[PDB]
Design a protein around this nucleic acid. Structure first.
Ligand SMILES: C=C1[C@H](COP(=O)(O)OP(=O)(O)OP(=O)(O)O)[C@@H](O)C[C@@H]1n1cnc2c(=O)nc(N)[nH]c21
Ligand SMILES: [Mg+2]
Lengths: 406, 553
DNA sequence: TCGCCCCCCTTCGGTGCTTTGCACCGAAGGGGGGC
């Protein structure tokens, strides 16, 4: 095999990200996994003269009770050259979101058969920590295409297509889209017979070397307005402040009629009858909120951004956009774990679900704006992560001025 | 000896050359200290003489070692270090005695001349050029280069640690039931073998180290308790910190208080209830390390309380992996928290404190959550798992908090423990307007160019007010407008503002603040009975907000 | 007149917001401790 020469972007150096503390069982899993990978030559032990590092941890899915090593190559990926400039990128198929069942398969092991450019391997270094710092950290670097590095699907592109071609040929109405280490496989087949074809694809790939999503069932949840028999001064201030905000998104939204219903300095609990004009103005605005917004189109050259608001009782609203107030999608995520009492677990799972929808729909994950303290998130989020990819995120503290999305 | 281990290749940063810094004068006692070390170092091959073809140099000096008679040779490689490549440091943290399990037999060993036993990359040695001054005027000094790791070079610690790890790796794999804590060249070796079998394995380990050029002198070979290790004393059933001597001063400087606070933080790992808020306050606004700072009355009280704690003997115990980890937190006031980690009651593994002020406005529930997160992180480091928490907060208080607060938040498995003062929410805002309560439409504005502003209100019952403000901001005037509504209203009040900013602070239910004005608002909110606070967009001319916007102009 | 590591407390300065100050956060100053 001959390696593909890979570079970082001009004027950029490799990642230098610290390893964070790991539990005893995550450390032991990584030691077992890395020891086996080292014997098989997929990784090599290195010293400290390699100045780069990338954090490593481990996840375990509930329906696959074996640990899965997870290297957080997000920084290395941002610094790696683009392969759309070196002509090795993947096209997203428009038909995947049209399927009634989408199964996620982890095909990361296929990368371990292709060696990595000798000059690039130093950028893939990671460090396994030690309980109570009994020893210094143990460092490895990759000799093959690493799981989680964006260069691996690009370099392995020709190989994976030759592997899938017979299956895609035999099942022309099944759509398979590769995103990093995952295959997203959708069909309109009956659910028990969808899983049968997933097993056939599983077996066909082993000839070389998840749970069902339903985009059919993802719905948009728009801006709704309350409906009552009687309305207070406070209700109309809450109503007008909401529509005023929504006039940044929708076209021709009016608050003069309702606004005046509030003239003078009135008590908040005073009941004000709706004038017929205002009532017309209301039902007018309710209709614009009902059917979607004109003139909003996906731009593949721009990043996706996702905002999330905690609404309470396991409910989480979210919006996906590229330019402010031009939401490509608004939705609501609902918890169902059974206990009802962990915000961080619910937000982490909400992040995975929203990012999963972005992969199915657009082919990439959005940069998240998380409504959580950075230190609260970083204390717990790895305990609930189940994806082989990790999206970009940042941390925001935005009080709800209006209960907009609920 | 010099380890026959392979050298680690190192480079200078791209485009950079080597250091060229002259040697400073030194005393004759240090010159003969260095000449004795260097003459013996050259005999053992640690250094080699060089000539004028090598254009580099770097200054050298010497301090004394804790072993009182020995000197330690050091080289001021600050110039070379800046031009040396970066390294990824493999020392990720400091081992703690609370993370040790009880062991039948224990040994502590230290490697002699550790760094000098590891060879340096051959192509790199020319950059370590130095000189011994020898009574500076009499003659030009003799020049050498290092053949081994120098003390003072940026790469020496990591290259040594990496070499020590390789040397120990065969012995570790052959004896998984022998715990070897490896910190630099200090080796803690514990086992559950009988003392004769244990001493056999130590001989084997020491002989393995010697074949790779690492001696273990008898002087630093500890065989019987108490073992001196990482600043602690290891007894069979317990461990203590080595004695902590607090500074004692008639007149305190800034630097004295800095030393004192550092001592107390070190002590807080096993001495419960240490506080440093009032002593650290004395450091604020100071301008020089030698500035005399008079202790406040509160700082004297805090220091006296810490001294009483420090005169009582304490000890930690060792980790039993078959039992639960339990972390208990107590509130101490003014954003200070102390905690104990134990498994059996009244036998602490370690203690600690949390007292950081994060953000301008916060409350006790947030800070308790931060203390929980610090303890969780510390417990993962030391024991590889999260403890069960005992917290002075009612389950109702917490449940109230994480359903009203708009950010995701959580605490792991925890049990209420009634140790006053309890953590509580000091007020809550009604989710609905309050029947029969006055309705205040507040607003404030400031002219950015000038320093002036106004804050005022109008009410449903006909009350109106305006207060001129000087040296203010736009955000301060809005807090002032809320400040006045609370001042002039009864125990129940409805307030409507157009400041998303002010709404954001108050809605988070802060109970403390770096801001004097926000503190006053907090004090007023605590006195109130019911408070509903609402927001409307500005300049859209809505009801009462338009008239209060009218008024402040 | 040095090096590398962890910790806390204070100070400073860069970032981005439908801002004009403000809150957030990483880095660096001081201190403790280890070898
Ligand atoms: C951890 C270290 C090794 C083992 O630390 P050590 O105290 O056991 O010393 P060493 O084995 O050399 O002599 P020994 O034979 O008496 O045991 C020493 O090589 C070097 C290093 N270290 C220690 N303190 C200092 C210091 O202040 N400044 C510097 N640059 N480096 C230092
Ligand atoms: Mg030594």
């Amino acid at each position: 095999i001959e390696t593909v020469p890979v570079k970082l972007k001009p004027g950029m150096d490799g990642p230098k990200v610290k390893q964070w503390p790991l539990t005893e069982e995550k450390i032991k899993a990584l030691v077992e996994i890395c020891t086996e990978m080292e014997k098989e030559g997929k990784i090599s032990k290195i010293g400290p003269e390699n100045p780069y590092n990338t954090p490593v941890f481990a996840i375990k899915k509930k329906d696959s009770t074996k640990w899965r090593k997870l290297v957080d190559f997000r920084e290395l990926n941002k610094r790696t050259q683009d392969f759309w400039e070196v002509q090795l990128g993947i096209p997203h198929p428009a038909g995947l979101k049209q399927k009634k069942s989408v199964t996620v398969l982890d095909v990361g092991d296929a990368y371990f058969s292709v060696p990595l450019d000798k000059d690039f391997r130093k950028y893939t270094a990671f460090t396994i920590p030690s309980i109570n710092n009994e020893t210094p950290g143990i460092r490895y670097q990759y000799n093959v295409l690493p799981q989680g590095w964006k260069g691996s699907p690009a370099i392995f592109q020709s190989s994976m297509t030759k592997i899938l071609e017979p299956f895609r040929k035999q099942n022309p109405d099944i759509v398979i889209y590769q995103y990093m280490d995952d295959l997203y496989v959708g069909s309109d087949l009956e659910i028990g017979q969808h899983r049968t074809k997933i097993e056939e694809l599983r077996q066909h790939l082993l000839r070389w070397g998840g749970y069902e999503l339903h985009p059919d069932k993802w719905t948009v949840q728009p801006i709704v307005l309350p409906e009552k028999d009687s309305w207070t001064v406070n209700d109309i201030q809450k109503l007008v402040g909401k529509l005023n905000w929504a006039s940044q998104i929708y076209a021709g939204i009016k608050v003069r009629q309702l606004s005046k219903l509030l003239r003078g300095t009135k008590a908040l609990t005073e009941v004000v009858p709706l004038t017929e004009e205002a009532e017309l103005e209301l039902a007018e605005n309710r209709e614009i909120l009902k059917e979607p917004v004109h003139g909003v189109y996906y731009d593949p050259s721009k990043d996706l951004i996702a905002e999330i608001q905690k609404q309470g009782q396991g409910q989480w609203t979210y919006q996906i956009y590229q330019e402010p107030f031009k939401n490509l999608k608004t939705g609501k995520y609902a918890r169902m774990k059974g206990a009802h009492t962990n915000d961080v677990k619910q937000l982490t799972e909400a992040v995975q679900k929203i990012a999963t929808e972005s992969i199915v729909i657009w082919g990439k994950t959005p940069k998240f704006k998380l409504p959580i303290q950075k230190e609260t998130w970083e204390a717990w989020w790895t305990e609930y992560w189940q994806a082989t990819w990790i999206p970009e995120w940042e941390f925001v503290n935005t009080p709800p001025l209006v209960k907009l999305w609920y | 000896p010099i380890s026959p281990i392979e050298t680690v290749p190192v480079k200078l940063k791209p485009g950079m050359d080597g250091p060229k810094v002259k040697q400073w004068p030194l005393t004759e006692e240090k010159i003969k200290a260095l000449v004795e070390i260097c003459t013996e170092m050259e005999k053992e091959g640690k250094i080699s003489k060089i000539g004028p073809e090598n254009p580099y140099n770097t200054p050298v000096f010497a301090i004394k070692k804790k072993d009182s008679t020995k000197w330690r040779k050091l080289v001021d490689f600050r110039e070379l270090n800046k031009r040396t490549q970066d390294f990824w440091e493999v020392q990720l943290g400091i081992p703690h005695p609370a993370g040790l399990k009880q062991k039948k037999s224990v040994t502590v060993l230290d490697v002699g001349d550790a760094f000098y036993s590891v060879p340096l990359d051959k192509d790199f040695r020319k950059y370590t050029a130095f000189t011994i001054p020898s009574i500076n005027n009499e003659t030009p000094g003799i020049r050498y280069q290092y053949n081994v790791l120098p003390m003072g070079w940026k790469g020496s610690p990591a290259i040594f640690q990496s070499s020590m790890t390789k040397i120990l790796e065969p012995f570790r794999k052959q004896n998984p039931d022998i715990v070897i804590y490896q910190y630099m060249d200090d080796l803690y070796v514990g086992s559950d073998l009988e003392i004769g079998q244990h001493r056999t394995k130590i001989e084997e380990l020491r002989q393995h180290l010697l074949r790779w050029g690492f001696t273990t002198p008898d002087k630093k070979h500890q065989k019987e308790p108490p073992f001196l290790w990482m600043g602690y004393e290891l007894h069979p059933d317990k461990w203590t910190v080595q004695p902590i001597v607090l500074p004692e001063k008639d007149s305190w400087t800034v630097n004295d208080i800095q030393k004192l606070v550092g001592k107390l933080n070190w002590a807080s790992q096993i001495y419960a209830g240490i506080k440093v808020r009032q002593l650290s306050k004395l450091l604020r606004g100071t301008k020089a390390l030698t500035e005399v700072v008079p202790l406040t009355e509160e700082a004297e009280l805090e220091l006296a309380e810490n001294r009483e704690i420090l005169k009582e003997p304490v000890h930690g115990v060792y980790y039993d992996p078959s039992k639960d980890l339990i972390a208990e937190i107590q509130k101490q006031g003014q954003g200070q928290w102390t905690y104990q980690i134990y498994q059996e009651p009244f036998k602490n593994l370690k203690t600690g404190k949390y007292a950081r002020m994060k953000g301008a406005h916060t409350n006790d529930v947030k800070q308790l959550t931060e203390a929980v997160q610090k303890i969780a992180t510390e417990s993962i480091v030391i024991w590889g798992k999260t403890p069960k928490f005992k917290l002075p907060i009612q389950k109702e208080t917490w449940e109230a908090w994480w359903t009203e607060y708009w950010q995701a938040t959580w605490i792991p498995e925890w049990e209420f423990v009634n140790t006053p003062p309890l953590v509580k929410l000091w007020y809550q805002l009604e989710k609905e307007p309050i029947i029969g309560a006055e309705t205040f439409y507040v607003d404030g504005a400031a002219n950015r160019e000038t320093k002036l502003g106004k804050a005022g209100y109008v009410t449903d019952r006909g009350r109106q007010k305006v207060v001129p403000l000087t040296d203010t901001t736009n955000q301060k005037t809005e807090l002032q407008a809320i400040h006045l509504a609370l001042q002039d209203s009864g125990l129940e009040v409805n307030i409507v503002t157009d400041s998303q900013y002010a709404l954001g602070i108050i809605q988070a239910q802060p109970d403390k603040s770096e801001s004097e004005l926000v503190s006053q608002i907090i004090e007023q909110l605590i006195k109130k009975e019911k408070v509903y606070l609402a927001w409307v967009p500005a300049h859209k001319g809505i009801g009462g907000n338009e008239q209060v916007d009218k008024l402040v102009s």
